[PDB]
Amino acid sequence: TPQNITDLCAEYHNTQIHTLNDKIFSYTESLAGKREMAIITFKNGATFQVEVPGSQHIDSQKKAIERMKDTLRIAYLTEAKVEKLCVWNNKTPHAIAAISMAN
Amino acid sequence: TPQNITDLCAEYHNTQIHTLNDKIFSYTESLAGKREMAIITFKNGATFQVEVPGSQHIDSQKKAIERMKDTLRIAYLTEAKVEKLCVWNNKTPHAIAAISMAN
Amino acid sequence: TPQNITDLCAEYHNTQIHTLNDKIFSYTESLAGKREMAIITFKNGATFQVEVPGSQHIDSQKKAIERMKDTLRIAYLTEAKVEKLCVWNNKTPHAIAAISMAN
Amino acid sequence: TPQNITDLCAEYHNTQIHTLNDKIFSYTESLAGKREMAIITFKNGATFQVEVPGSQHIDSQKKAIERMKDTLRIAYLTEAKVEKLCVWNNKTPHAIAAISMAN
Amino acid sequence: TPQNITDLCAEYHNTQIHTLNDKIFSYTESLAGKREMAIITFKNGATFQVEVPGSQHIDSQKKAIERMKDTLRIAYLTEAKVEKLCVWNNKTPHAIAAISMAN
Ligand SMILES: CC(=O)N[C@@H]1[C@@H](O[C@@H]2O[C@@H](C)[C@@H](O)[C@@H](O)[C@@H]2O)[C@H](O[C@@H]2O[C@H](CO)[C@H](O)[C@H](O)[C@H]2O)[C@@H](CO)O[C@@H]1O
Ligand SMILES: CC(=O)N[C@@H]1[C@@H](O[C@@H]2O[C@@H](C)[C@@H](O)[C@@H](O)[C@@H]2O)[C@H](O[C@@H]2O[C@H](CO)[C@H](O)[C@H](O)[C@H]2O)[C@@H](CO)O[C@@H]1O
Ligand SMILES: CC(=O)N[C@@H]1[C@@H](O[C@@H]2O[C@@H](C)[C@@H](O)[C@@H](O)[C@@H]2O)[C@H](O[C@@H]2O[C@H](CO)[C@H](O)[C@H](O)[C@H]2O)[C@@H](CO)O[C@@H]1O
Ligand SMILES: CC(=O)N[C@@H]1[C@@H](O[C@@H]2O[C@@H](C)[C@@H](O)[C@@H](O)[C@@H]2O)[C@H](O[C@@H]2O[C@H](CO)[C@H](O)[C@H](O)[C@H]2O)[C@@H](CO)O[C@H]1O
Ligand SMILES: CC(=O)N[C@@H]1[C@@H](O[C@@H]2O[C@@H](C)[C@@H](O)[C@@H](O)[C@@H]2O)[C@H](O[C@@H]2O[C@H](CO)[C@H](O)[C@H](O)[C@H]2O)[C@@H](CO)O[C@H]1O
Ligand SMILES: [Ca+2]
Ligand SMILES: [Ca+2]
Ligand SMILES: [Ca+2]
Ligand SMILES: [Ca+2]
Ligand SMILES: [Ca+2]
Numbered sequence: 244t245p246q247n248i249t250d251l252c253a254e255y256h257n258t259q260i261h262t263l264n265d266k267i268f269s270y271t272e273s274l275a276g277k278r279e280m281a282i283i284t285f286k287n288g289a290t291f292q293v294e295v296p297g298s299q300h301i302d303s304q305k306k307a308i309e310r311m312k313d314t315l316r317i318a319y320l321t322e323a324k325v326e327k328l329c330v331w332n333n334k335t336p337h338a339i340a341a342i343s344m345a346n
Numbered sequence: 347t348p349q350n351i352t353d354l355c356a357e358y359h360n361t362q363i364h365t366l367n368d369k370i371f372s373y374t375e376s377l378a379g380k381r382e383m384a385i386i387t388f389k390n391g392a393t394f395q396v397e398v399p400g401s402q403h404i405d406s407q408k409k410a411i412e413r414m415k416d417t418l419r420i421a422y423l424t425e426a427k428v429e430k431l432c433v434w435n436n437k438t439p440h441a442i443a444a445i446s447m448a449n
Numbered sequence: 450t451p452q453n454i455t456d457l458c459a460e461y462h463n464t465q466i467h468t469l470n471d472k473i474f475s476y477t478e479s480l481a482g483k484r485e486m487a488i489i490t491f492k493n494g495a496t497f498q499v500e501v502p503g504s505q506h507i508d509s510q511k512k513a514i515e516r517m518k519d520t521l522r523i524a525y526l527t528e529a530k531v532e533k534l535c536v537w538n539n540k541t542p543h544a545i546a547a548i549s550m551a552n
Numbered sequence: 553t554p555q556n557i558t559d560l561c562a563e564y565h566n567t568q569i570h571t572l573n574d575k576i577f578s579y580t581e582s583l584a585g586k587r588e589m590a591i592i593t594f595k596n597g598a599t600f601q602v603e604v605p606g607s608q609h610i611d612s613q614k615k616a617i618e619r620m621k622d623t624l625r626i627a628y629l630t631e632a633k634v635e636k637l638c639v640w641n642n643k644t645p646h647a648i649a650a651i652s653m654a655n
Numbered sequence: 656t657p658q659n660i661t662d663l664c665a666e667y668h669n670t671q672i673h674t675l676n677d678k679i680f681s682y683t684e685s686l687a688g689k690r691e692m693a694i695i696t697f698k699n700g701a702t703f704q705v706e707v708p709g710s711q712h713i714d715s716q717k718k719a720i721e722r723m724k725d726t727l728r729i730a731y732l733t734e735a736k737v738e739k740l741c742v743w744n745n746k747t748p749h750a751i752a753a754i755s756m757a758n
Contacts, residue, residue: 246694246702246748248683255687269429269448271351272417274396274410275358276403278444282349290349296406300688303708306721307686309409314684314728316417319447320424321732326681336349341685344731372532372551374454375520377499377513379506381457381547383450393452399509412512419520422550423527439452475635475654477557478623480602480616482609484560484650486553496555502612515615522623525653526630542555578738580660581726582753583705583719585712587663589656593757599658605715618718625726628756629733645658 248343252329258340261289261328270319272312281312282336283319290336291328311339318344351446355432361443362435364392366428373422375415384415385439386422393439394431414442421447454549458535464546465538467495469531476525478518487518488542489525496542497534517545524550557652561638567649568641570598572634579628581621590621591645592628599645600637620648627653660755664741670752671744673701675737682731684724693724694748695731702748703740723751730756 245251252258263285271282281293293312296305318325326345330337348354355361366388374385384396396415399408421428427449433440451457458464469491477488487499499517500506506514524531532551536543554560561567572594580591590602602620603609609617627634635654639646657663664670675697683694693705705723706712712720730737736758742749 244690244692244704244706244747247696248685248694251683251685251687251690251694254690258687269446271354271444271446272410272414273351273354273432273444274407274414275354275432275443276407278348278354278357279406279410280347282351282354284350292347304686304688304691307691309413310721310724311684311686312413316420317728317732320420320426323732329685329687335347340687341683343681343683345681372549374457374547374549375513375517376454376457376535376547377510377517378457378461378535378546379510381451381460382509382513385452385454385457387453387551395450395452412516415516419523423523423529438450475652477560477650477652478616478619479557479560479638479650480613480620481560481564481638481649482613484554484563485612485616488555488557488560490556498553515619518619522626526626526632541553578755578757580663580753580755581719581723582660582663582741583716583723584663584667584741584752585716587657587666587753588715588719591658591660601656601658604656618722621722625729629729629735644656 248327248329248341251341255340257331257333258329259332261330263289263325263328266322266324267315267319270316272316281315283315291330292334292336292338294334294338311342314342351430351432351444354444358443360434360436361432364431364433366392366431369425369427370418370422373419375419384418386418394433394442395437395439397437397441414445417445454533454535454547457547461546463537463539464535467534467536469495469534470552472528472530473521473525476522478522487521489521497536497545498540498542500540500544517548520548557636557638557650560650564649566640566642567638570637570639572598572637575631575633576624576628579625581625590624592624600639600648601643601645603643603647620651623651660739660741660753663753667752669743669745670741673740673742675701675740678734678736679727679731682728693727695727703742703751704746704748706746706750723754726754
């Protein structure tokens, strides 16, 4: 299996790496019906979503989606540096597929 | 798909953005029957709930309701600055739909 | 809908408010069969349980029971000041219905 | 309903209280099949498990077993002082039934 | 039942102990389809996965797999020293079976 986010991201169609090397600037979370999601931004204005669970997910990606929103919240609150995100770039905002964190 | 809490709130009827730019002053949680809910307040007396799950919520919102109460608890304990709340204003106290945090 | 713990407590029979204004002194939790519960005390010796889930609880409370134990453990570990508890006072020890944290 | 760990421990056969008054020295966790468990140690070498779930457990204990593992991990990572453990002494290592924390 | 990670690790085929005595250098998390997993690395370049749940795993392991990803995330964010890992060495990268923390 790939051993880093760059290699993991490159296996998938319609994906790309954003290199942030920065903490999350804002964290937004919604419980509204059909927008049960999180949205993050960085200081540079880059904005990312964790997608609303739907038909494009295999429904074990379901637990993974919830984990990812947990990780973004704790990263925000701990000012953890986000190294890279692997995103689907065919969504607006870009939708997070993977995150890497390093000091 | 919205990129911020203001645009997301505008997708919903009978909602309003409140801007607090302040940490939560009090956090209340209840397990009592029919009042399984959370209430937050700010120093200025603004008071909001996460509603008891009911018929105004769809299946997809149930997990998000639990998530939002987790988020408010950790935000209170971290003294995290709350930027904005998107709220349903036909409820008293007003009911949270979404939160944004930035500092 | 109540906007504070005192008003919420008054919607039930056999409840009362304790005003602690103090951090949790001790936190005890048990996985022993039929005693799957938590117990907290304060420096003045006031002692409270989260009750074992049983037939006296409705389905909607089961998540909220789990949540309350999560809340008491993180409040203990962060030395958070507990303002008030709403408790059923026909249990020994008093059983927690709601909690408020402020200051 | 007991009001302290010592009184809870005395409801059960084959138990005893260990009085540690110290933080957890090591935390071990396993996902290997048939050893889905946690093990903690103290500096003096006292060693305790949270049992692998099985037919020795009633249904109401399964959430509490998961909770106890959560509690031990956060206790370890916060260096929380463990006052007492109630354990079954007919297991090797001794199996945790309850924990109390105080400072 | 084993009392430490080395003895646990000797219970399985195709496993070995790695002794790190270091905090995790990076934490990677993916929800990408069929690759829902975490990857950690240490400063020496040692790289480990928590494997995607699949047919090598029995039902009793599924909660433990999710727990182990929770553990690595919080270990990462607390800069907790990892003492040893027990891994399956017939995977790439080596797959985590168990973890011990001590400092
Ligand atoms: C506890 C209390 O009475 N506080 C009030 C504020 O009202 C609460 O908070 C607002 C946001 C809402 O959730 C109310 O239902 C609560 O009782 C009150 O805020 C104003 O409330 C009105 C309600 O229609 C509008 O939301 C305004 O936009 C708010 O400014 C303030 C000011 O009147 O006074 C107390 O702090
Ligand atoms: C361990 C012990 O005996 N503690 C007592 C207090 O009682 C405990 O805490 C109260 C809140 C209740 O849960 C009891 O069942 C516990 O044993 C005791 O508190 C008073 O308790 C009575 C009820 O029995 C009323 O609730 C009063 O409002 C409480 O002040 C205090 C003071 O009497 O003494 C020991 O700390
Ligand atoms: C190539 C890389 O990114 N790192 C390597 C180490 O290998 C990685 O980590 C090990 C533990 C294993 O998961 C490999 O699959 C990874 O690529 C490599 O560690 C040694 O790896 C060998 C197996 O190839 C043995 O497991 C040794 O015990 C490990 O120390 C080291 C060489 O020491 O080089 C880079 O750090
Ligand atoms: C809120 C906003 O419009 N911000 C702009 C950035 O765009 C956002 O973030 C990127 C990563 C995508 O999720 C966008 O959909 C989102 O609106 C914008 O970032 C650039 O977006 C490009 C696509 O339009 C592309 O992904 C590029 O890689 C990325 O750098 C930046 C720079 O143009 O400006 C912000 O204001
Ligand atoms: C690794 C080791 O040998 N530790 C010693 C303790 O034993 C461990 O911890 C106890 C609580 C049990 O879980 C043991 O199975 C485990 O090895 C030892 O504890 C004493 O062990 C006695 C018999 O093994 C008996 O259980 C007794 O209750 C307990 O106090 C302590 C104290 O002598 O020393 C460690 O070195
Ligand atoms: Ca800062
Ligand atoms: Ca402060
Ligand atoms: Ca202190
Ligand atoms: Ca220390
Ligand atoms: Ca550091």
